[model samples]
Target: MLVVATDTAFVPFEFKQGDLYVGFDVDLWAAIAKELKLDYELKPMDFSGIIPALQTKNVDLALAGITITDERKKAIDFSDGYYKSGLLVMVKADNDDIKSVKDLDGKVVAVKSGTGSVDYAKANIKTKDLRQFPNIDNAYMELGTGRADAVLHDTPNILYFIKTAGNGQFKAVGDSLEAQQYGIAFPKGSDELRDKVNGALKTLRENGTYNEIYKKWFG
Candidate 1:
């Protein structure tokens, strides 16, 4: 059986909930794996380990909410974009000190390391203190408890974190950094597997399974 490595803390994507691993990516993969008749080991892992695991051939697939970028493209192949998303700035609700990205200059911003938000924060926010965390949850907590002034990250994960874990204490604060997309990543030159996944994804959307899974997490 092929092994699939996933970041287990990316909620609404592939996070572990209780005893089971569940989320949007989990369900979506279930549908595709069924269609392709794939029998694979689903392994939970640190978010940073996913790409390296793929490069090492330790895993046959990766389904985390990985944003496709030019840099990553040099190292891996991706399926056609599956989700349209973008980076968002978030602040504690009722925080009057900072209203938007325009107000973030010189502020301390927390971000998950290895994400697009780190670059965005460094380049756009002008914040000298760009605190980096290993994952979204810690960065989010750092912001919510006032250790940091703001948290910047992908919209879906940030939104889910604030709504579910932040207890309405945090809210997204500015226009998206830019429109972006997420894709299923494979090791470099895996064109056949990439094409198969793309076909299965297209089939899922056409057959209504995609919408079902989308609503399950996003609705």
Candidate 2:
């Protein structure tokens, strides 16, 4: 069986609830596995370890709603983009001061390490501070506690957090940043597996299976 790497807390994508890991990524990967007749076990870890685990061939493949970035392509191959996502700014509900990325200048911002937002924020924000976390949930906690002025993270994850746990205390502000796509990653030479996963993904998209799962989580 293949070993699949995933995140422990990228909500609405992959996360732990009770003792089971579940979400869009979990369900989508299951469907993909069925289509390919693939057998695999999940290995949950910090987001930062996913790509490296692949690079070292410790995990056969990964589906973490991982962004397909140029830099990542240098180290590993990615399946066709499975999800459309972008970064969004999250702030406390009463915050009127930080409405957009432009307002982030000289402000403390928290972001998850090894994510696209980390690169985007460092390049774009003239920061008073930029804090990085292995778990994005900690970034949100930093914002809620007023230690960080804002959180820049994937749109769906932030929106899901706001709905389920925010208690009306958080609101997403500003336009979406770093428009990107999520892909399943493979070890650099796994072209055969990559193409099969891509084919399965295409089948899911065309047969309306993808929409059913998307609506389950987002709607």
Candidate 3:
């Protein structure tokens, strides 16, 4: 059996709801497992540990909504891009001074640790006041309480918050700072398994199973 690794929680992607783990990444992986006839067990862990686990061959797969990046590609093989995503800036709805990524200059920004948002902020934004939290929820709270001027995170996760928990108190601003794609990751040596997953993903897309899963969470 394959040990498929995943991040413990990343809203709409993979997060615990009640006692059972559920989300787009979970359902999508289940479908891929069924299609490939692979017996697998999910091993949920901190996002920081996932890459190391894969590098050490501790897991056979990962579906953590991990953004595909050049740095990560050097350590592990990735399935073809399965989901397109990007980074967005979020701020209090009543605030007007910050309207875009450029506006974030000299502003206090909150970001979840170990994500592309942090990288983008450090590289592009002039702010030296970037605060990182282990969970994005804390980052959101930092913005909500006025401790932080803005929050930067995955566009989908931020949009989900704005639509649901934000209660019209917040809004996403500006164009995406980075274009990203989520992919299933495998250890460096697993070319065959990686290809199999890629094929299964393509099959799912053609059959509309992928769309059905996407709609369930996104729509």
Candidate 4:
């Protein structure tokens, strides 16, 4: 059986709905499975454990908002990119002092552990107070409690949290960090399965199924 792992709280991508999983990634995977005529189970794991889960053979694929990076490609094979997103720095809405990365020089910047956002902050931001949280929600909490000076994460997630969790307390600042592409992740050497999934994904894109799902959550 195919096991697809994803982050549990990445709304509009994959999030918990009671005991069931629902979101853009869940729907996209369901469509891919239907097209390939495959049976699978959805597993929710911590954001940092997805690749490790694949390494341990606990999951066959990951549909989380995992980015396509050279470092990650060494550990897993990625399908054709399916989504493009940008990084965003968010802060309290009333705080105008932290408007850019340069403003974070001596401040605490929070990011989800094991995410590209963390890697990006480490590589690009010259901050001595970088904090890694287990998930985005915790990072948001840190920002809310004034423990973190700012947060670096995906633009979509930042927007979602501002609307759903910020309570008008937070707002995004500066330009997005960088545009990145996301792909389905599989165990290394799973070219056959990768190709199969890619084929199904291409069909979905061609037949408008991809756009329909995209609009469902994002539009």
Residue pairs clashing in model 3 are none
**Model 3 Cα lDDT, one tens digit per residue, 1-219:** 999998877788888889888999999999999999999898888777888899999999898889898999999999999999998999999999998989989999999887778888988999959998877888999999999999999998999878878998899999876888999999998999999999999999999999999999999
Window of ten residues with lowest summed lDDT in model 1: 119-128
Query: Which residue pairs in candidate 4 collide?
Result: none
Best-matching candidate per lDDT = 2
Query: On residues 1-219, what C-alpha lDDT tens digit does candidate 1 reach at each position?
Result: 878878868888988778899999889888999999988878988778888888888888798898888999988888888899998889989898887788889999999887788878777778968999888889888987888999888888888887788787888887776799999999987788889999999999999999999999999
Over 71-119, each residue of candidate 2 has an lDDT whose tens digit, in order, gives 8999999999988999999999999999898999999999999988889
Which structure is stronger by lDDT: 2 or 3? 2
Regions of candidate 2 where Cα sits further than 4 Å from its true position? none
TM per candidate: 0.95, 0.98, 0.95, 0.96
Q: Which runs in model 4 stand beyond 4 Å of their true positions?
A: none
Best by TM-score: 2
Q: Whole-model lDDT, candidate 1? A: 0.87
Number of clashing pairs per prediction, in order: 0, 0, 0, 0
* Candidate 1, residue 4: how far the Cα is off, in Å: 1.1
Candidate 3 Cα deviation (angstroms), residue 125: 0.4
